[PDB]
């Protein structure tokens, strides 16, 4: 009874062409209608394959809009491009002027950093005296900042690096004066020895900028000694680097609860100028593995701080440097799992005899250190261009990210004449800046500032200061949100539309053909 169930479904079915086929009395008509039915089915299959695979492309969609939701005020990190304190630097210079032999100066100071610095430099003095004409490029690299940040305890450097009370003259946020002890957080950087992060504290002494953050910073180097001859002062310079010799402040504007990286991000402000940073907040939201790539955690990190793609990329570079050169770059984060790995610039291998002789062994050790540095730098420059290596580190963009488009601007802060007189008075008579250093531990700095910043030379002295203004220019955030382009619901709708357009079947008609198949089973 195949024919039986066949004609039954035929006469009562809701499907379109099959009926005419089943009830076609004319032979040529049966041929025509079978042809039409199968052609339509074939085209339906074509379009269904197309749409099904388009959905399987797990495509992506994006929208952009301005929204009134306010972002949290950004964290502002300020670094003085000069790493060491002015009094410390002048002390070093004057010690070397009194006696140029570092070995003799190890016991001429009670300051811990000075003793460590002289001890470290003494290991290289004979080599420098004997071979500087033959290998100047070597000694210029050995005597760089990063070497000292890699070989001296950061807790010892912090006593000689720029101090907060000697760096931030004044600070204001949201119409109130900052509490520097509670709002500024110190952190150590291999190049910018001491850096400070401002974390906003909303109002619970009313003065200052009402709609943002403003501070006056001591950033110039005018009070350093001006020698008659070029003299070598290790640990101040960084040979052949982009941020070398510069004077001013390095400013990084970044979301709160994120680690800054001043050596490869941020903005620069020269001394004597007032900088205005117009912050235009931006927010990006991203979708997960199937529809895209994003991460809410650092694959290399402990997960304590908010995720930024820079962290993953830098830790990946450190991974590859350690793998290739057998040492870690001091200018990159230390991998948490590998605290035992030595920095590439480490020099604990040097014998004590190198403080007294320029022997070949000391020279060979010097060149081996130079070669380690070369290895690390070569890998740093090469690896970013190696897409295989970078993809192996799984550094996907953050799933929820706040970005800041900053509009830069400069003006000359202390104006000539009466306006500048008022500025000078505000600093030195009301805030009484130079009396901060009237202590047992900073008497020399007090005398230096007293002689330097006196009234008669304010027009020149004041140009060592810089002012920063950071404010949110637009109250409305530019949001940019990803989304799935082709939902399961849209898939179902479009497959149904195609099904109706090509064969006329509906899901109830699907149950109908299922009934026919079950009827054939029962037969």
């Amino acid at each position: 009874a195949i024919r039986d169930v066949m004609t039954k479904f035929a006469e009562q079915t809701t499907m379109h062409g099959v009926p005419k086929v089943i009830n076609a009395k004319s032979s040529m008509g049966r041929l025509f209608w079978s042809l039409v039915c199968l052609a339509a089915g074939a085209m339906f299959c074509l379009q269904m394959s197309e749409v099904l695979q388009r959905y399987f492309s797990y495509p992506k969609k994006v929208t952009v809009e301005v929204v009134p939701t306010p972002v949290p005020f950004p964290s502002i990190s300020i670094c003085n491009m000069r790493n060491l304190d002015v009094h410390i630097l002048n002390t070093l210079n004057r010690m070397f002027i009194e006696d140029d032999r570092p070995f003799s100066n190890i016991n001429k100071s009670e300051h811990e950093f000075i003793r460590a610095y002289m001890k470290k430099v003494a290991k290289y003095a004979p080599l420098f005296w004997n071979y500087q004409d033959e290998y100047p490029e070597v000694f210029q690299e050995i005597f760089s900042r990063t070497t000292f940040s890699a070989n001296i305890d950061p807790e010892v450097i912090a006593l000689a690096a720029v101090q907060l009370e000697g760096f931030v003259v004044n600070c204001h946020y949201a119409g109130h004066r900052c509490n520097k002890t509670r709002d500024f957080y110190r952190f150590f950087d291999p190049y910018y020895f001491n850096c400070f992060t401002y974390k906003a504290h909303e109002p619970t002494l009313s003065e200052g900028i009402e709609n943002g953050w403003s501070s006056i910073l001591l950033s110039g180097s005018g009070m350093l000694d001006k020698n008659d001859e070029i003299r070598m002062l290790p640990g101040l310079h960084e040979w052949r680097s982009a941020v070398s010799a510069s004077e001013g402040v390095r400013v990084v504007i970044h979301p709160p609860s994120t680690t800054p990286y001043p050596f490869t991000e941020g903005y620069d402000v020269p001394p004597g100028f007032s900088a205005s940073f117009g912050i235009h907040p931006r927010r990006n939201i991203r979708i997960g593995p199937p529809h895209g790539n994003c991460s809410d955690k650092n694959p290399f990190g402990d997960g304590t701080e908010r995720y930024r793609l820079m962290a993953c990329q830098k830790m990946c570079m450190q991974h590859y440097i350690v793998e290739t050169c057998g040492c870690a770059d001091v200018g990159l984060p230390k991998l948490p799992l590998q605290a035992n790995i030595s920095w590439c610039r480490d020099d604990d291998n040097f014998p004590d005899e190198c403080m007294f002789t320029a022997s070949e062994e000391c020279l060979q050790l010097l060149m081996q250190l130079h070669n380690r540095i070369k290895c690390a730098r070569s890998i740093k420059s090469k690896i970013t261009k190696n897409t295989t290596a970078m993809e192996a580190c799984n550094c996907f963009p953050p799933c929820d990210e706040v970005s800041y488009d900053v509009s830069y601007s400069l003006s000359k802060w202390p104006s000539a004449g009466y306006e500048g007189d008022a500025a000078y008075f505000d600093v030195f008579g009301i805030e009484k800046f130079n009396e901060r250093f009237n202590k047992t531990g900073t008497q020399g700095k007090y005398e230096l500032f007293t002689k330097y910043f006196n009234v008669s030379n304010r027009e020149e002295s004041m140009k060592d200061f810089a002012r920063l203004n950071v404010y949110i220019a637009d109250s409305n955030v530019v949001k940019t949100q990803e989304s799935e382009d082709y939902t399961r619901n849209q898939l179902v709708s479009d497959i149904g539309g195609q099904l109706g357009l090509w064969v006329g079947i509906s899901l109830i008609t699907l149950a109908e053909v299922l009934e026919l198949i079950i009827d054939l089973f029962r037969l």
Partner: peptide, 4 residues
């Protein structure tokens, strides 16, 4: 000779 660059002295220190």
């Amino acid at each position: 000779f660059m002295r220190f």
